[PDB]
Amino acid sequence: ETTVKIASDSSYAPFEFQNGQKKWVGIDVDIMQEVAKINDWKLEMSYPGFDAALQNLKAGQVDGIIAGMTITDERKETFDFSNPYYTSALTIATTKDSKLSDYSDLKGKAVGAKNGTAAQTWLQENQKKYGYTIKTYSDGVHMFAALSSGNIAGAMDEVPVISYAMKQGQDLAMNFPSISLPGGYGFAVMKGKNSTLVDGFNKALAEMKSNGDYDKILKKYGITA
Amino acid sequence: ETTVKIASDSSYAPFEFQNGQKKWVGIDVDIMQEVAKINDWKLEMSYPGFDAALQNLKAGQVDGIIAGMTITDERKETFDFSNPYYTSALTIATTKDSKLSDYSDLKGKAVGAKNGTAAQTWLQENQKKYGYTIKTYSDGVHMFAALSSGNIAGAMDEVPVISYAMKQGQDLAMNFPSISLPGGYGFAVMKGKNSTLVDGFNKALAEMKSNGDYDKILKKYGITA
Ligand SMILES: NC(=[NH2+])NCCC[C@H](N)C(=O)O
Ligand SMILES: NC(=[NH2+])NCCC[C@H](N)C(=O)O
Ligand code: NA
């Protein structure tokens, strides 16, 4: 009944990614599809990439974005957000048999993050305090390979990313604290616009938490912390 | 197996509280029981109240504390902590049919909080910014009854506490932004003592986060990790 165009990232597991059949799957895909059905929306998903999705949203070529997008006060100056649909935390992953548990245990060790991330910033801000060296990576495939090889002692990323990788059978544990960003992940529209879409998102999310569909989706993608 | 004596609060749902059959339950209870099992400890829980628990810990009558205890610099002068096992936050609960969605909407409205809480402090610190009046309550039963009756327009409390109240079927919604409580909640021992207990807690938490048991426990009380 109402056509709703949503843009998303092209590859950001477990939020949105293609499986082996090239079907779009992930937490964001499954949530958005169920929200649309609850609200009687005809959903038209596109996957141009995070940056392109933002460009398209601002130009009015799409109506909203869901793309592992952390809610921040700066972003709220441009966008209106839903209630968060998942908590947004960071953590340092280790290999499965690692006994590292505390930040002081990284002294003298190398710790990875992806270039241009909150994780990179945290590591930079805490390097002198705990005495590790930092290694920067292009993507998760390279960072986690380095962790499994022992070339780094830890890899800092978003908790859902590490959880998914773990569920897939990667050699990983979550031995360190979760560092919370308060915003959570949100559905976004342009500021002042499409408040009915945000409200339908909010109402559907509440129903899904209530009826257990929300928890089914998280467990499908191995999201446990 | 060695006996481990742990003290907690007497009523802090959903962390520790007595249910309808008068059984001690909650996130802290379930986590501590699973940590003990993982570590082959015989756990002896007591529930004298937070302040009594600190007294008992300082006197050597118990070995540790779990009681939604914020990790703070002040506290770290007396106590050693585990990695935080949960990071709480503050937000405004409204009735389910309330249309309020942001702090600016509270101008000219009465907003409640419990006496002697972070929520109260936050409200007092932000009153001039948003322009509400503050009403103080002894406990949750009283604050939430005032909200349901329309005598207050919102109630400031912790996300986990509101989440559980909603699970129990109270007429509540969480449509406002959250305010992070720096530190997270940790397991505590006397400074320099009982390193075995802190290490056992850290390693067991990592296993429970890694194997899904941590998530299952939160979900039982309506909380998303
Ligand atoms: N699909 C994505 N890469 N989304 C952005 C992920 C990084 C971070 N959560 C952010 O909001 O900036
Ligand atoms: N009944 C309660 N709400 N107890 C709260 C006391 C613990 C509080 N989070 C603190 O760290 O000081
Ligand atoms: Na906290």
Numbering used by the authors:
A (entry chain B), B (entry chain A): 27 to 251
Sentences from the paper on this structure:
The adenosine triphosphate (ATP)-binding cassette (ABC) importer GlnPQ from Lactococcus lactis has two sequential covalently linked substrate-binding domains (SBDs), which capture the substrates and deliver them to the translocon. GlnPQ is an ABC transporter involved in the uptake of glutamine, glutamic acid, and asparagine and was found to be a robust model protein to study the mechanism of substrate delivery from SBDs to the translocon. SBDs operate in a Venus-fly trap mechanism, where the binding site for a substrate is located between two lobes of an SBD, which is connected by two antiparallel β-strands (the hinge region). We report three high-resolution structures of SBD1, namely, the wild-type SBD1 with bound asparagine or arginine, and E184D SBD1 with glutamine bound.
In addition, arginine binds in the substrate pocket but is not transported by GlnPQ. The effect of nontransported substrates on substrate affinity was shown using FRET measurements, where arginine, histidine, and lysine can competitively inhibit the uptake of glutamine (via SBD1 and SBD2) and asparagine (via SBD1).35 To investigate this inhibitory effect, we aimed to obtain the crystal structure of arginine bound to SBD1. Unfortunately, we failed to obtain well-diffracting SBD1-Arg crystals; hence, we soaked crystals of the unliganded SBD1 with 10 mM arginine. In the obtained crystal structure, there are two molecules of SBD1 in the asymmetric unit cell, which show a slightly different binding pattern of arginine. Most interactions are with the large subdomain and the carboxyl-side chain of E184, which makes a hydrogen bond to the α-amino group of the Arg. Similar to the binding of the high-affinity substrate asparagine, the α-carboxyl group of arginine is stabilized by a salt bridge with R101 and hydrogen bonds to the backbone nitrogen and the hydroxyl group of T96. Clearly, the bound arginine traps SBD1 in a conformation that is unable to close, hence explaining the inability of GlnPQ to transport arginine leading to the inhibition of the transport of Gln and Asn. It is also notable that this binding does not affect the global rearrangement of the protein structure. Furthermore, partial domain closure has also been demonstrated for ligand-binding domains of ionotropic glutamate receptors iGluRs. Together with the fact that also in solution arginine prevents closure of SBD1,35 we believe that our observation that arginine is incapable of triggering the conformational change is correct. The presence of l-arginine and l-histidine at the binding site leads to the inability of SBDs to close fully hence leading to the loss of transport activity of the transporter.
